[PDB]
Design a protein around this ligand. Structure first.
Ligand SMILES: O=C(O)CCC(=O)C(=O)O
Ligand SMILES: [Fe+2]
Length: 269
């Protein structure tokens, strides 16, 4: 009912789990906890997630409610009401400096570099040659990927599930949640992700699963969901996926290199 997750920290040689066994369990479960660097201020992000949906009467972030999909050439960005309790504000990195408040873009840039370090520690453990990392990761092994900083609010007045079962797109998700609600289908039972506001929740997406399907330890994009909320809940996440402006989505074939599977666009769909 409550999942037991391995905990890691970012140190000098990438991810430091307690030992090599723990790291292998974590990567194999597809979800683990990552301690939040003590210098990293998350308070502006927390407030944005509590406010973005409220409209221009609420300062300083309520006005972002009015930036809907039409203000962007990209269908998927801005404020969106979902079918579940969730509503969201989503923005890819190319737009952070112009659109987000400056302190929110800063948070996004910190998360991007933190996510980059986590991703490289994961690629090394998969036995992929370093010179293939950039193309395998669609740029995320450097700072060339696509990055979404996404803010979530669950409308407890809506009778739906919070957010229905899904696997993330992309390579790596760093999730900041401070309230009960997240659930993962680790083995075959649904389990609650325990609350720990001093850690992020890290999991992988479909592009990571595709990439590593033929490795020694294939990595899985874990199915997860948010249960029906009786009171409001908010959260936010940093999502890394392939740059899509490159082209392809790849699978690594040991001893041979990268095989193109599909495109950036058709995978999101
Ligand atoms: O709000 C959460 O805790 C989960 C959000 C999530 O899984 C997503 O945005 O894809
Ligand atoms: Fe998700």
């Amino acid at each position: 009912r409550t999942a037991d997750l391995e905990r890691a920290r970012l140190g000098d040689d990438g991810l430091d789990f307690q030992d090599d066994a723990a790291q292998a369990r974590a990567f194999a479960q597809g979800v683990f906890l990552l301690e939040i660097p003590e210098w990293l201020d998350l308070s502006a992000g927390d407030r944005f997630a509590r406010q973005f949906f409220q409209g221009t009467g609420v300062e300083p972030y309520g006005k972002y409610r009015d930036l809907s999909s039409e203000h962007f050439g990209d269908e998927l960005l801005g404020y969106h009401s979902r079918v579940d309790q969730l509503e969201q504000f989503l923005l890819e990195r190319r737009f952070w400096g112009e659109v987000y408040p400056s302190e929110i873009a800063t948070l996004g840039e910190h998360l991007t570099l933190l996510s980059h370090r986590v991703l490289r520690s994961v690629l090394a453990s998969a036995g992929i040659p370093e010179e293939d990392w950039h193309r395998a990761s669609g740029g995320c092994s450097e700072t060339n990927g696509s990055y979404h900083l996404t803010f979530n609010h669950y409308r407890s007045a809506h009778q739906d599930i919070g957010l229905s079962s899904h696997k993330d797109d992309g390579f790596i998700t760093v999730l900041r949640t401070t309230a009960q609600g997240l659930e993962v289908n680790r083995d075959d039972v649904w389990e609650k992700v325990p609350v720990d506001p001093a850690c992020f929740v890290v999991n992988f997406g479909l592009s990571m699963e595709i990439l590593t399907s033929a490795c020694v330890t294939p990595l899985s994009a874990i199915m997860h969901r948010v249960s029906h909320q009786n009171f409001d809940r908010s959260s936010f996440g940093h999502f890394s996926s392939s740059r899509c402006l490159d082209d392809g989505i790849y699978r690594y074939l040991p001893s041979a290199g990268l095989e193109r599977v599909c495109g950036s666009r058709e995978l999101i769909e």
